[PDB]
């Protein structure tokens, strides 16, 4: 019933402001609970940032007090994060979460936020052609910022799929591969397409991966 969903820009420049939204469905943010912002840094450390209660009272992490604002829109059942004067140290995945005095039950899916002066760039998608068991894939190259999502055959193919963590190249652009292993006999009968999405650049690419 109760669901939280983050939204935000994905990329902001050093020194400017970050603004994020959490949309709450299936529960009124004025009824009960404290409504929290929590972030996770690249090396996986978690930090609680602040909350706004059902009554509108706020509490902040003292480490952020001078640049943090947590606000709400009760008519839209949304609450907000503002973080001023961001630096590269504010690059993180940002989460919204509920608290009722007993438990932190409900979390958003998270939104990835990169602080960088670099511009958004859409990926090029190249096939990794299959030449018992065969492997095939897609190389998703030269995009910025994170993240990309990859599925196979519009979600119909999930077994044996491995999508690897992106690496940052010397160019300052990310590259990743996604692969799947399938029966060799299926290569003449089953079509294989990787579905790549890069939301920051509004890039949606379906790339056929054909035997070569």
């Amino acid at each position: 019933e109760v669901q939280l969903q983050e939204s935000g820009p994905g990329l902001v420049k050093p020194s400017q402001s970050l603004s994020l939204t959490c949309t709450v469905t299936g529960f009124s943010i004025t009824s009960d609970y404290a409504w929290n912002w929590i972030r996770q840094f690249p090396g996986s450390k978690l930090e609680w940032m602040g909350f706004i209660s059902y009554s509108g009272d706020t509490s902040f992490n003292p480490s952020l007090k001078s640049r943090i604002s947590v606000t709400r829109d009760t008519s839209k059942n949304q609450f907000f994060l503002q973080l001023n004067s961001v630096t590269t140290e504010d690059t993180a995945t940002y989460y919204c979460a509920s608290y009722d005095g007993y438990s932190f039950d409900y979390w958003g899916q998270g939104t990835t936020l990169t602080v960088s002066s670099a511009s958004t760039k859409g990926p090029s998608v190249f096939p990794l052609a299959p030449s018992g068991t065969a492997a095939l894939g897609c190389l998703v190259k030269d995009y910025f910022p994170e993240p990309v999502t990859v599925s196979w055959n519009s979600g119909a193919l999930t077994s044996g799929v491995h999508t690897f963590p992106a690496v940052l190249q010397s160019s300052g652009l990310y590259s990743l591969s996604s692969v799947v292993t399938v029966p060799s006999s299926s290569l003449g009968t089953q079509t294989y397409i990787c579905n790549v999405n890069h939301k920051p650049s509004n890039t949606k690419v379906d790339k056929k991966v054909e035997p070569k």
Binding site: N36, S44, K45, L46, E47, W48, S59, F60, N61, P62, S63, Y95, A97, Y99, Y102, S103, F104, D105, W107, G108, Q109, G110, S124, F126, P127, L128, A129, S131, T133, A135, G137, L139, K141, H162, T163, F164, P165, A166, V167, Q169, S175, L176, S177, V179, T181
Partner: protein, 216 residues
Amino acid sequence: DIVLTQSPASLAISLGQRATISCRASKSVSTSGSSYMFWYQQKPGQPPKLLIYLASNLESGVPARFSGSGSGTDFTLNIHPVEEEDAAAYYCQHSREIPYTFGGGTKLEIKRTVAAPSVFIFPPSDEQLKSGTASVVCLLNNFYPREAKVQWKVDNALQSGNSQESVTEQDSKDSTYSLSSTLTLSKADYEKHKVYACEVTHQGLSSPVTKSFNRG
């Protein structure tokens, strides 16, 4: 601020056995007759998932294989029996006072039998070659343990400084890892050479496995 210290930082546990993770607090997180301690599980691409609340209470929809105990400054998460899908990071957190803070996390690895990688090599696509760059990809599929060595050979010459690799998290079903290594060359350098080889060393292999192709 209260500092939460987790121990150990990582552990490897066999299926059916017990995993024990400790969280120690710099001062008491117990007040008003409750212990404000929480345990989370997290897998990549996903939010933390609450397992245990107020030190000892099971979250709805979480298997009873998970249990929490302790009070004051000393807390323990127990997993028994350990299952394949428990491969994850685990975090403690308190809500005793502002600010709420988290432990540094513990990585649980599920022990399984040694498994050799299946190795695959992929030439750069013709589409990519149009762009002036060539990426050669080597895949090491479904191996255990995580330690593996990949070496790139171009016309029998050992490569250095022009490759990047990344490794998946442990598989939730078969407890294996997979690894991708990418060799990056200019189209010019790629066209200058013929033999492209990926050589894999892993304890599951009696001797290195080399997969290669000839450009053409």
